[PDB]
Amino acid sequence: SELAGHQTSAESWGTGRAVARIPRVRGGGTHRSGQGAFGNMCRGGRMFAPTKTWRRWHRRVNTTQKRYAICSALAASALPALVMSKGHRIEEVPELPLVVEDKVEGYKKTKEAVLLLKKLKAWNDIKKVYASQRMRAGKGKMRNRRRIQRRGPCIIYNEDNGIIKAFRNIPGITLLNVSKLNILKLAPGGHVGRFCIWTESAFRKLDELYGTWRKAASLKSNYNLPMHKMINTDLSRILKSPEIQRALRAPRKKIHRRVL
Amino acid sequence: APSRNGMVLKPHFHKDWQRRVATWFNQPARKIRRRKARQAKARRIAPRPASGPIRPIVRCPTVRYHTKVRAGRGFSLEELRVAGIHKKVARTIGISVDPRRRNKSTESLQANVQRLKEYRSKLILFPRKPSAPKKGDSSAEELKLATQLTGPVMPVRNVYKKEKARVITEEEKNFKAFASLRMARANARLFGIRAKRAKEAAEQD
Amino acid sequence: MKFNPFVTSDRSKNRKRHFNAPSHIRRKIMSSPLSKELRQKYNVRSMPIRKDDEVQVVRGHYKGQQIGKVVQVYRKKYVIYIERVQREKANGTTVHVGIHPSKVVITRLKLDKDRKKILERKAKSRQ
RNA sequence: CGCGACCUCAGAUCAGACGUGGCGACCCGCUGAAUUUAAGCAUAUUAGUCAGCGGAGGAAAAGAAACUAACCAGGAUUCCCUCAGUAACGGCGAGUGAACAGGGAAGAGCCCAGCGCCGAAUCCCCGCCCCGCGGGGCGCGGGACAUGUGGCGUACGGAAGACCCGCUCCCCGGCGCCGCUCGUGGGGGGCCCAAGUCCUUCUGAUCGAGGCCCAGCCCGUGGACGGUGUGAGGCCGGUAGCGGCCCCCGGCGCGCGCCCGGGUCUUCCCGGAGUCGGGUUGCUUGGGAAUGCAGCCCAAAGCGGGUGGUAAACUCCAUCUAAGGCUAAAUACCGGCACGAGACCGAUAGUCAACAAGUACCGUAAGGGAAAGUUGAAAAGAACUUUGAAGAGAGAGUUCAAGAGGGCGUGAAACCGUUAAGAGGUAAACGGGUGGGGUCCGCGCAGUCCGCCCGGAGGAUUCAACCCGGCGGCGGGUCCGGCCGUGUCGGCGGCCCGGCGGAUCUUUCCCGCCCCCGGGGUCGGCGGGGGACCGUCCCCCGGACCGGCGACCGGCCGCCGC
RNA sequence: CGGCUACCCACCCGACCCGUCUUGAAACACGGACCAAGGAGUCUAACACGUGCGCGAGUCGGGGGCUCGCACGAAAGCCGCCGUGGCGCAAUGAAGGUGAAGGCCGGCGCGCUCGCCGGCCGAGGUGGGAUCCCGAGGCCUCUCCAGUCCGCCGAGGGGCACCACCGGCCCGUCUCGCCCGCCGCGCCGGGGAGGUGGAGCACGAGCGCACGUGUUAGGACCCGAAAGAUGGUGAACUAUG
RNA sequence: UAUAGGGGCGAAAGACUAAUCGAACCAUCUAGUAGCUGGUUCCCUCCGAAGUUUCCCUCAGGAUAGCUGGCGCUCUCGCCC
RNA sequence: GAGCCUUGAAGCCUAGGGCGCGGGCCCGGGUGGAGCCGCCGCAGGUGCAGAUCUUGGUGGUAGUAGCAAAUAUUCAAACGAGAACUUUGAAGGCCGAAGUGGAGAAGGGUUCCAUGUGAACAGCAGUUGAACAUGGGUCAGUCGGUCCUGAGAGAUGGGCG
RNA sequence: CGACUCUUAGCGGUGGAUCACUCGGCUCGUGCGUCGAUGAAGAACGCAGCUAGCUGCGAGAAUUAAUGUGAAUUGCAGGACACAUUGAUCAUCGACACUUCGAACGCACUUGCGGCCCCGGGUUCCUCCCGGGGCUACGCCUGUCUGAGCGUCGCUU
Ligand SMILES: [Mg+2]
Ligand SMILES: [Mg+2]
Ligand SMILES: [Mg+2]
Ligand SMILES: [Mg+2]
Ligand SMILES: [Mg+2]
Ligand SMILES: [Mg+2]
Ligand SMILES: [Mg+2]
Ligand SMILES: [Mg+2]
Ligand SMILES: [Mg+2]
Ligand SMILES: [Mg+2]
Ligand SMILES: [Mg+2]
Ligand SMILES: [Mg+2]
Ligand SMILES: [Mg+2]
Ligand SMILES: [Mg+2]
Ligand SMILES: [Mg+2]
Ligand SMILES: [Mg+2]
Ligand SMILES: [Mg+2]
Ligand SMILES: [Mg+2]
Ligand SMILES: [Mg+2]
Ligand SMILES: [Mg+2]
Ligand SMILES: [Mg+2]
Ligand SMILES: [Mg+2]
Ligand SMILES: [Mg+2]
Ligand SMILES: [Mg+2]
Ligand SMILES: [Mg+2]
Ligand SMILES: [Mg+2]
Ligand SMILES: [Mg+2]
Ligand SMILES: [Mg+2]
Ligand SMILES: [Mg+2]
Ligand SMILES: [Mg+2]
Ligand SMILES: [Mg+2]
Ligand SMILES: [Mg+2]
Ligand SMILES: [Mg+2]
Ligand SMILES: [Mg+2]
Ligand SMILES: [Mg+2]
Ligand SMILES: [Mg+2]
Ligand SMILES: [Mg+2]
Ligand SMILES: [Mg+2]
Ligand SMILES: [Mg+2]
Ligand SMILES: [Mg+2]
Ligand SMILES: [Mg+2]
Ligand SMILES: [Mg+2]
Ligand SMILES: [Mg+2]
Ligand SMILES: [Mg+2]
Ligand SMILES: [Mg+2]
Ligand SMILES: [Mg+2]
Ligand SMILES: [Mg+2]
Ligand SMILES: [Mg+2]
Ligand SMILES: [Mg+2]
Ligand SMILES: [Mg+2]
Ligand SMILES: [Mg+2]
Ligand SMILES: [Mg+2]
Numbered sequence A: 001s002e003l004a005g006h007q008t009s010a011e012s013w014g015t016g017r018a019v020a021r022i023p024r025v026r027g028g029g030t031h032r033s034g035q036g037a038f039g040n041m042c043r044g045g046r047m048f049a050p051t052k053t054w055r056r057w058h059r060r061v062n063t064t065q066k067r068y069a070i071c072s073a074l075a076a077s078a079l080p081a082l083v084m085s086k087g088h089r090i091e092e093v094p095e096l097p098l099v100v101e102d103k104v105e106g107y108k109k110t111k112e113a114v115l116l117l118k119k120l121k122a123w124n125d126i127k128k129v130y131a132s133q134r135m136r137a138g139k140g141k142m143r144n145r146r147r148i149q150r151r152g153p154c155i156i157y158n159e160d161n162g163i164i165k166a167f168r169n170i171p172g173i174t175l176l177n178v179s180k181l182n183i184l185k186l187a188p189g190g191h192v193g194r195f196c197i198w199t200e201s202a203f204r205k206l207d208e209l210y211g212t213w214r215k216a217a218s219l220k221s222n223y224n225l226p227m228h229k230m231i232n233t234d235l236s237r238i239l240k241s242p243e244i245q246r247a248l249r250a251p252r253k254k255i256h257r258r259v260l
Numbered sequence B: 001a002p003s004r005n006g007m008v009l010k011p012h013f014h015k016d017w018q019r020r021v022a023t024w025f026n027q028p029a030r031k032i033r034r035r036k037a038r039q040a041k042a043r044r045i046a047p048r049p050a051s052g053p054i055r056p057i058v059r060c061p062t063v064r065y066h067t068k069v070r071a072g073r074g075f076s077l078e079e080l081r082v083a084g085i086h087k088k089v090a091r092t093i094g095i096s097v098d099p100r101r102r103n104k105s106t107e108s109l110q111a112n113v114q115r116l117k118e119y120r121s122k123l124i125l126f127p128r129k130p131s132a133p134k135k136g137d138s139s140a141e142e143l144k145l146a147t148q149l150t151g152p153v154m155p156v157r158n159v160y161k162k163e164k165a166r167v168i169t170e171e172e173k174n175f176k177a178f179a180s181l182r183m184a185r186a187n188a189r190l191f192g193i194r195a196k197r198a199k200e201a202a203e204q205d
Numbered sequence C: 001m002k003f004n005p006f007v008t009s010d011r012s013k014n015r016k017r018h019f020n021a022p023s024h025i026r027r028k029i030m031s032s033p034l035s036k037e038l039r040q041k042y043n044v045r046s047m048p049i050r051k052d053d054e055v056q057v058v059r060g061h062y063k064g065q066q067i068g069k070v071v072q073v074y075r076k077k078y079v080i081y082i083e084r085v086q087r088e089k090a091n092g093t094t095v096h097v098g099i100h101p102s103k104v105v106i107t108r109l110k111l112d113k114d115r116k117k118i119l120e121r122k123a124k125s126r127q
Numbered sequence D: 001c002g003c004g005a006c007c008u009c010a011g012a013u014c015a016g017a018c019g020u021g022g023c024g025a026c027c028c029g030c031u032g033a034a035u036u037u038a039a040g041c042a043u044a045u046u047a048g049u050c051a052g053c054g055g056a057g058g059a060a061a062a063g064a065a066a067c068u069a070a071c072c073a074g075g076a077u078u079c080c081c082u083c084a085g086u087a088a089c090g091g092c093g094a095g096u097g098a099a100c101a102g103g104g105a106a107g108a109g110c111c112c113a114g115c116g117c118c119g120a121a122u123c124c125c126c127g128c129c130c131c132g133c134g135g136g137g138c139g140c141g142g143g144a145c146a147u148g149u150g151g152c153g154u155a156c157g158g159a160a161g162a163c164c165c166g167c168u169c170c171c172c173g174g175c176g177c178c179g180c181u182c183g184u185g186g187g188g189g190g191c192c193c194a195a196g197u198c199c200u201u202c203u204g205a206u207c208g209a210g211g212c213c214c215a216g217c218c219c220g221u222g223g224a225c226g227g228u229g230u231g232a233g234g235c236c237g238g239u240a241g242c243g244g245c246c247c248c249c250g251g252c253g254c255g256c257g258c259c260c261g262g263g264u265c266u267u268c269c270c271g272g273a274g275u276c277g278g279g280u281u282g283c284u285u286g287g288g289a290a291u292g293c294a295g296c297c298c299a300a301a302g303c304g305g306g307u308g309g310u311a312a313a314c315u316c317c318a319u320c321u322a323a324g325g326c327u328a329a330a331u332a333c334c335g336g337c338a339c340g341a342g343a344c345c346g347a348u349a350g351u352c353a354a355c356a357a358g359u360a361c362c363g364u365a366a367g368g369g370a371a372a373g374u375u376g377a378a379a380a381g382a383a384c385u386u387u388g389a390a391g392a393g394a395g396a397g398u399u400c401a402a403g404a405g406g407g408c409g410u411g412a413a414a415c416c417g418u419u420a421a422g423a424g425g426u427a428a429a430c431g432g433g434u435g436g437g438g439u440c441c442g443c444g445c446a447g448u449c450c451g452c453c454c455g456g457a458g459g460a461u462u463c464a465a466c467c468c469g470g471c472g473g474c475g476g477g478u479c480c481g482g483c484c485g486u487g488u489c490g491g492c493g494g495c496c497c498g499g500c501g502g503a504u505c506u507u508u509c510c511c512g513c514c515c516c517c518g519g520g521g522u523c524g525g526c527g528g529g530g531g532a533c534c535g536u537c538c539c540c541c542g543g544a545c546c547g548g549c550g551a552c553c554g555g556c557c558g559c560c561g562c
Numbered sequence E: 001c002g003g004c005u006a007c008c009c010a011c012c013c014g015a016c017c018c019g020u021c022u023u024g025a026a027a028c029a030c031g032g033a034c035c036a037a038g039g040a041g042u043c044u045a046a047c048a049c050g051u052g053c054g055c056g057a058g059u060c061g062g063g064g065g066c067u068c069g070c071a072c073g074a075a076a077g078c079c080g081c082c083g084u085g086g087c088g089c090a091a092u093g094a095a096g097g098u099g100a101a102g103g104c105c106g107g108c109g110c111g112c113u114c115g116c117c118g119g120c121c122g123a124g125g126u127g128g129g130a131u132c133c134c135g136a137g138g139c140c141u142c143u144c145c146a147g148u149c150c151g152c153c154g155a156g157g158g159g160c161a162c163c164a165c166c167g168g169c170c171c172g173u174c175u176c177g178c179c180c181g182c183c184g185c186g187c188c189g190g191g192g193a194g195g196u197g198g199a200g201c202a203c204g205a206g207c208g209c210a211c212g213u214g215u216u217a218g219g220a221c222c223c224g225a226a227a228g229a230u231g232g233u234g235a236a237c238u239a240u241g
Numbered sequence F: 001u002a003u004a005g006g007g008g009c010g011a012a013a014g015a016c017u018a019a020u021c022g023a024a025c026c027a028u029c030u031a032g033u034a035g036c037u038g039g040u041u042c043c044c045u046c047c048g049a050a051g052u053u054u055c056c057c058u059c060a061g062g063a064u065a066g067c068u069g070g071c072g073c074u075c076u077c078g079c080c081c
Numbered sequence G: 001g002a003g004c005c006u007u008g009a010a011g012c013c014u015a016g017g018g019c020g021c022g023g024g025c026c027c028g029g030g031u032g033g034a035g036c037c038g039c040c041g042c043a044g045g046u047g048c049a050g051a052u053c054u055u056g057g058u059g060g061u062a063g064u065a066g067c068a069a070a071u072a073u074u075c076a077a078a079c080g081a082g083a084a085c086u087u088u089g090a091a092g093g094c095c096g097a098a099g100u101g102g103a104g105a106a107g108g109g110u111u112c113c114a115u116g117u118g119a120a121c122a123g124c125a126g127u128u129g130a131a132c133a134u135g136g137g138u139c140a141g142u143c144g145g146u147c148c149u150g151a152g153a154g155a156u157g158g159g160c161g
Numbered sequence H: 001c002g003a004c005u006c007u008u009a010g011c012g013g014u015g016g017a018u019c020a021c022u023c024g025g026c027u028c029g030u031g032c033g034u035c036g037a038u039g040a041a042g043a044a045c046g047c048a049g050c051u052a053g054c055u056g057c058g059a060g061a062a063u064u065a066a067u068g069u070g071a072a073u074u075g076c077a078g079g080a081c082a083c084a085u086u087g088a089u090c091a092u093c094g095a096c097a098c099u100u101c102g103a104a105c106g107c108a109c110u111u112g113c114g115g116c117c118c119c120g121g122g123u124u125c126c127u128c129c130c131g132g133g134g135c136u137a138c139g140c141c142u143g144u145c146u147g148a149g150c151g152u153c154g155c156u157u
C-alpha cells in the first residue's frame, strides 16, 4: 500500500449527531462528506496490516543441506519406479540414467535434437507435454502466466557447444548444467525423481564433482558424501532372514473375541 | 507487561524507524553494476592488471592482529628512495606511494625493498614510440597475458617459520618458569617508586 | 522464447499498444497473407492491404470462391470492407460487413513503383 | 583664483555580462515543538526529528590528518559486514548509545598566501588584417587592471641557487581518412521461417483422431497480443558475433604553439591571528573536571602549538602541523524522462481517480472532494402494418440467442405483484414424534435374483491328455567358462612416462641473499624450486569371502505361447 | 408400490430473543427494521522454550568475489591463503590480574597436624539405577552316551542416563602459621591448612535453518475521545475606532 | 479602511470574532494515548478453572504464588513373594 | 490427472436423489456463455449475526401526517386531443402613492426577447414559466469608471532580521 | 362463497451481489540527468465546417516547414485522387512561430496613464496630433563618460 487511505482528513463526531464514533470526512455538497473514513471496516478506507515491503521474503539454507538435497534428487532420479510414479513415460525408454555420446553436445539445429529424442524414446515424454499445454486456472492468467505446461525431461551436460540451441524451444525440456545443479530444476514441486538425460563427460564428471565414500570431492573443497542410515535396507529380506526368525516367540493368530 | 523467566529486553524502536528502512532489494543489482564496472575497466582502461597498483607487506597495529599481515596502502617514501626511483615515476610505473607511512623496522624496510625488486623484475613496460627504452622485443609473445587477478603478488605471504627438529636442552628448561612473568609484572608496577626511594636514600644522607 | 529485455510479454502493455497504435503501425497490423501462386511468383509471405486489392475471403459467413475488390479500410476499427460482401439492413439498404484482414487471402495486388520497391525489399530480406 | 594627479565616491535607458522564480524523492546550512513513554510528572525519551526558512547538482556533502594507536604499528574521503546493543550516558529509572581495530567496492592526487629570483616576462578590452565547414583562436597596432603586488619557478612528502657526473630529445589543443570495438559503440525508421491443407461439429474456428517404415511442416523463432473460441505456423511481434541505408561520439596518421629532469657537495629559506587557548554562559553528544558549536570577556608562543579519552604540577616519549583552497570513484533517490518484471488487487478491492478526476460539487478563503467499467462477432440499434396526440404497446424482422432492445453480460437476497397448493381466534416462528396432502424420484406392478459344480436332454468346435518343433521367463549345482565387489600382501610397478594433503625432512641438492677471513668457511641465519617419508585411488596375477540389486553362455527339472 | 427428506397443513408434549458486562438477563439492562458486499490477533526486530533437519568441538557466508551476453536467472553454483567476524569450547574479580587432576606404590628428612626422588593408574567414592554378562538347578515317549535342539532361572557381577549425599579443583575475600627461587635478594614473587561468596571444572553440545507457543518495542486485534504543538485562512455575520 | 487566535474587540453578558468562542477555522504531527465502553469471522474431539496469599499513589489495574493445559522423560506389574 | 468441457466451464435458482455427526459436498433439472477443478506440497489481505459496524438497496410506518400566515373569485369565448389554473371580453375585489407601482447601488450572469416541445423540472396541472432546444439582443467627448486625495495601505534611502 | 394474513414453488418488477474480463493501479529493479531573463512552473482567454468536456495547439492557433513510411481521416457533406509532378494520413521533429497575466520588467494594475527614437499618412514640421516598429524593472561586475569633496599634494593669482 505504502501510502494508505489516510489521505482523507477526518474527525469523529462524538455524542451528538449520533451516527457512530468512526472518523468522518468533513465538508459538504459532495455526498462522500459524512461517510466512513480510514479504518478497516469502511468503504475506501485502509486495509488491516498494510503489507509492508520489509517482510522476511528470502530464506537462507545451509549449503550442506543444499548439497544433500541435490544428492538426494540425483539418487532418486536413478530408480525407475520413482520417475514412473512422478509420471514420465519410461515404457520404451532404454537403460536408466541415459548416457549419450559427446557428439550430442555439438548439435546446431533442432531437427537432430527431435530425432535424438525420438530414437531414445523421450519423444513420448515430449508428446505428453504437447498433450498438456492448456490454459491457466483462476486469476493467474492476468499476470502473463496462461500456460499449464508440465515438466518433461532434463538434459544435464557440460561444455555448452550448441546444445542450448538444440534444446531451447522443445516444449517441457530443461536446460541444466553439471557444474550448476539446480534443486528447482532437478525436483520441481518438491517431488523427487525427474527423468534426466546425461552425457559421457557429465556422467564421468559427477564422480569428480562429488566423490565416493572413499575419497572426497576433488572439485569442491570440503564436501563428502553423507553416511547412510541403513547399510542394507531390504526390510523384507531382513524379516525373512534366518537370524531374525530363529529368535521369535511364535506366530499367535488367535482372536479370542467377546464371550456373551 | 513483563512475564515469566525471560531476558530483560530493551529494543531501540521508540524512534520512528518505519521511514528509514533500507532493504537490499537492489543487492543483485549492485552486484551486476559492479561486475560490469570492473569488466568495463579491464576492457576499456588499459592492459594494466585489475586492482592496479602494488600494495605493501604491512603489520596490523594491535596486541590482537599484529601477528598477522596485510596489504597496506603505499610504499613509504624512504623505502621507495632505497629502491631508487622518483615518486611520480613510480606512480606511473604502477607503484602505490603513500607519503605518510614511516619506517621503524629494518626488517619490514628490506621486505618492502625486496618486494619492489620483485615487482621491477616482473615489470614489462611499453613506451609510445618504438625506439625501445628499457624494453626489448616482443618478450614472451607480449607476455602471453595482459590481466592479473587479486593482487599482482598475492600480498599476504603468511610466513611459515617451522624450527621443528630440536632436542630439549640444559637448565633453561629449569630457568624459564612461571615466576619470570610475575617478576616482570611486579618490576613494571614498582619501577619508578624504587627509583624515588633510591633518590630519597641518596638525598637524606 | 523472448530474450530482449526491452520488449514486453505484458498483456496490458501489448493490448494498450495494439488498441492505441498510430496509423503507420496499424498498416503493419492490418497485413494480409497472399495466395499460393502469388507467393510462389513473388517470394513474399504477406503484404499490407490497400484500397484496390483483390480479396478471397477464407473464413467467416462467406468462405472462398468470391474473389472481390476491397473499397474501404477503417484502420480505426481494424476492418476492411469488400465490394462483393453485402448485408441488408432492416430498410432494404445494403451495407458492407466487417471483415478482419487477417482472415483474408489476397489473390491480386495493386501494381505501383512503390510496391515494386517494397516487394524488392521483401525478396532481398527473405534472401 | 584656476589647472592637474591620487583617493573616497554618485548618475545614466552608457558598451558587454550576471542573480531573482519553479520542482524539491536524494543532499547541505539554520531553526525546532508537542502528542507518546517514564503505568503519575518537571531531568530524560519522543528528537538534535515533524512543521518553518534558505541553497545547488545528477549526485550532493566529506576528502589528503593539528588522524588512529601505544606494538614487530598503520596512514585521504565515502559505503557494507563486524566491532555492539558493547565502552559510555541516564529521577544510573524509563530508556539512549558510538568509535579504533579487522575483512571487502573504490582507488587520485594536489594547489595557493609567506621565503626570495626573474627590468610586470601577467591579465581584460577596442580596431584592421592570416584563415575553415555547423563556430571560435595563435599574431599586428593602442585604452585600461596591476608595484598597497599579475604570471613562471615553488608547498612541509622539503624547496631554491652555484659547480661536478652521465644521459634525456619532449608534449598537449586543429584537420581528411582507413579496418575497427566484446554484445559483436548510441538511439531512431523499414524488411526476414513454417498447413491456412482433407473429414466432421460450430453462428464463427483457434475444437476433435490421422497425414507413409522416418514420423505432414519450420524451429538459434513453441514468449505475448489482436483476430467471430482454447494458435508455433493466418498477421507486425519472437531467435539470430542475421542482413542494407541514413544520423551522432570515441581512439590511428600530414601543419600551427610549447620543450629541461636525476645523483654528490656548498650556501640560503622554511609558513595561514581576535586565531588557538583560558574563564563563564546556552544548545548538542555516549563523551564523563565540560565531545562539538556559539555569545561575552581575557587573549599568545616560536626547542612553538594541538592531540595522548579523569581535573592539576614536574618530567620523558609517540604522532600531527591547524586558524587558506580544489578533487572522480564506491554511496543516496516515494520528484521527473523513457524501460522491464511481479506466489499483489480485480471496479465497495487497487492511487482520491480503469470513465470529460483533482472533474462535478461545497466553503469567503486556507481547503475539502465523490459516484460512475461490460449490448452484440458485426448495429445487422428493430424496415413495414396497426391502437394512441405522444410516452408506451401488438404483430413482423436482424442475430446462435432480444430468454442481449441504447447504464443493454451473468441477474441472488431484502421487498412487491400475480398464479398454483395448504391453513387461519390463544401474535408469528421452533425442537421431539407421527398422520394427511402435493411435487418429484426408482421400479412393473398377483411376471421378475445371480455365480460355481454335477447328473440328463439337442447341436457345433478345437486345444487340452502324451511326445516331437520353438522362442521368452523363474529356479538353483559345477559357481565349468569371463566381468565386477571386500580386506590383504607382492610387482614400489604410471613415484622421473601420478593425483590430493602434512608448522614430518634433507645447512652432504640448486638459485636470490646476510655474516667472518675476487676466492674460501655449512661457519651459522631468510625465502623459492628438485626429492625423502607418511594417509586414499589407477593395472596385474594368486588366494579368502560374497556371488549378495551384477550379468552372459553351456546343461538340468519344472513354466509357456504358437 | 416404496420414499427419508430445506414443500405445506394438523395434532400431543416441551419450549421467553439473540450478543455481552455481570454473582445473577427473557428482562422495566444496552446494540440489533431487513438484505448484499467489506470488516478485526497481521508484519518486522529481539528473547525464551519445545519440535524437525544438516554438520557436529566446532558451526554459519547473511559481506564481497568468480561463471558467456540468456525468459524463469533479483534464482541457482563455487570460493578455503575470502573464516575478518558472530555463537560455543573458561570462569571468577570493581580492578590490577589469576584461571579448573588428582590418586596409588617404594625409599628418605623426627610418616613429625611435614617436604624430596623413581615408577604406575587416571576425571573420585557411596546408595538407588533401564539394559547387559556369568550361572546352581531341573525340562522334552520305553536303556548309558553326546551336540544347537523344548525351556526358564535361584544367587552373583560390570554398571548407561539421571537423582540424593560426601570428597576434590579454579577465582575474590577471611583466619592461622611455615617454606622456596632470583636477568638481581626488595613495603620481590610463588606456595600450605581450614571457613565462605560464583551464573564455574569435575570428558565438552554447540552452530545454522525452519515451524509452533508466549513476551517485549514498533500504529501492534479493530473503533473511539476532553487535550497539546507547528504553519497558514477569515472583521461579507458581529464587537470597536 | 484598521485591529487575526492565547490574539482581536467588548457602556462588561467571558458576550462577539462567518449557524462554532471559558480560546475560531483548515491541514500536519496523528492510525496521539487510554488501566475505560462496544466488537472480534469454520466444524468435531479431549482436558478444563478462579475471584484467593503477598507487593505496588495499590482498590475498574498489574506483578508473584495458587488453580489449568500442552510437550515429554525416568521407572514398575504384566509367569512364598 | 494423455483431467473436464461451446455436443456448454464458472456463477445463480431448485416441492429432485443422496452422503457425512458436522465444517460442507456429489449428482439430477432450468438460465448462463469461457473459463474451471481433483491429489501432494507451498503462501495468505482466508470464513461473520451483532461493533448507536462503513457503503449501497428495500419494507412496516403509509396512500398516513401534510400541500391552512397575508379578505376572492365568477361567466362566456378562443387556441387546443385534453382547461379549477393559458389568453381575451365582462363582473366583483385586494395592494391604496410609508404600495402587491415606476427605477437604481451590492449581488445574479442571460435569467431580457421571439419561435417550437411538454418525458425531466414547477411539490396537482398546464396549451403555461425564470424548464428545455434554436435564434437574437447591451452602440456615449458632454452617464459612470478613468483624474484627485480622505481614514489608511505601501517601495526605494536607512535600520533590524 | 369470497376478502385479508401466513408458508413454499413458478413467472414477472426494484436491486446490482457473485462469477468471467481489464487500454487501471500498487510494489521492485535497471538506464539517463533535462527548467528560467533567449521569459520557467502555473493561470486566463482563444482556436475545428458541424465542436460542451478531455486531449492538441497559439491570430501561421485541432497545427506550419523538413525527414521517414506509403493511400488515407472518418459520424456526416466537402475537397485536393494527382503519384512516367510535390505524396493523403501517421510518427519523428533538428527549421519557423509561440496572445495576455505570471521571477514579470515603463508605473500600478481600475485592459488605466505615461516618456524617448524611428517609419507612413492627417494642416507634407515639432508645437501634449492617428497607425506601426524598437526601447524604458531592481541589485550587481568589468570598462567608458560625466562631476562632488575646507580628504592629500604639485604648479600658479
Ligand atoms: Mg501518512
Ligand atoms: Mg494524512
Ligand atoms: Mg483504497
Ligand atoms: Mg474462481
Ligand atoms: Mg498475561
Ligand atoms: Mg513516533
Ligand atoms: Mg502491468
Ligand atoms: Mg532558487
Ligand atoms: Mg497512561
Ligand atoms: Mg499527563
Ligand atoms: Mg534532545
Ligand atoms: Mg521539514
Ligand atoms: Mg539540474
Ligand atoms: Mg599537507
Ligand atoms: Mg554481540
Ligand atoms: Mg534500561
Ligand atoms: Mg538522542
Ligand atoms: Mg498465439
Ligand atoms: Mg488468441
Ligand atoms: Mg510469420
Ligand atoms: Mg604548548
Ligand atoms: Mg606538547
Ligand atoms: Mg601523559
Ligand atoms: Mg590522563
Ligand atoms: Mg587545509
Ligand atoms: Mg581544507
Ligand atoms: Mg560521488
Ligand atoms: Mg462487480
Ligand atoms: Mg475505487
Ligand atoms: Mg465488441
Ligand atoms: Mg401513430
Ligand atoms: Mg443462450
Ligand atoms: Mg444485462
Ligand atoms: Mg445474458
Ligand atoms: Mg462474453
Ligand atoms: Mg427473481
Ligand atoms: Mg389462495
Ligand atoms: Mg462471569
Ligand atoms: Mg449489578
Ligand atoms: Mg435489550
Ligand atoms: Mg435499539
Ligand atoms: Mg462477507
Ligand atoms: Mg531448539
Ligand atoms: Mg577468528
Ligand atoms: Mg484518535
Ligand atoms: Mg501538556
Ligand atoms: Mg502562526
Ligand atoms: Mg462590514
Ligand atoms: Mg460595542
Ligand atoms: Mg497555546
Ligand atoms: Mg457565532
Ligand atoms: Mg473552556
Ligand SMILES: [Mg+2]
Residues within 6 Å of the ligand: none
Ligand atoms: Mg489552542
Ligand SMILES: [Mg+2]
Residues within 6 Å of the ligand: F031
Ligand atoms: Mg488503532
Ligand SMILES: [Mg+2]
Residues within 6 Å of the ligand: none
Ligand atoms: Mg471432564
Ligand SMILES: [Mg+2]
Residues within 6 Å of the ligand: none
Ligand atoms: Mg506500600
Ligand SMILES: [Mg+2]
Residues within 6 Å of the ligand: F059
Ligand atoms: Mg484490589
Ligand SMILES: [Mg+2]
Residues within 6 Å of the ligand: none
Ligand atoms: Mg468493566
Ligand SMILES: [Mg+2]
Residues within 6 Å of the ligand: none
Ligand atoms: Mg501467573
Ligand SMILES: [Mg+2]
Residues within 6 Å of the ligand: none
Ligand atoms: Mg498437567
Ligand SMILES: [Mg+2]
Residues within 6 Å of the ligand: none
Ligand atoms: Mg473442490
Ligand SMILES: [Mg+2]
Residues within 6 Å of the ligand: A048, G045
Ligand atoms: Mg481480514
Ligand SMILES: [Mg+2]
Residues within 6 Å of the ligand: G045
Ligand atoms: Mg492476496
Ligand SMILES: [Mg+2]
Residues within 6 Å of the ligand: none
Ligand atoms: Mg452482515
Ligand SMILES: [Mg+2]
Residues within 6 Å of the ligand: E019, G049, G050
Ligand atoms: Mg457474534
Ligand SMILES: [Mg+2]
Residues within 6 Å of the ligand: none
Ligand atoms: Mg448500525
Ligand SMILES: [Mg+2]
Residues within 6 Å of the ligand: none
Ligand atoms: Mg423507508
Ligand SMILES: [Mg+2]
Residues within 6 Å of the ligand: none
Ligand atoms: Mg388524519
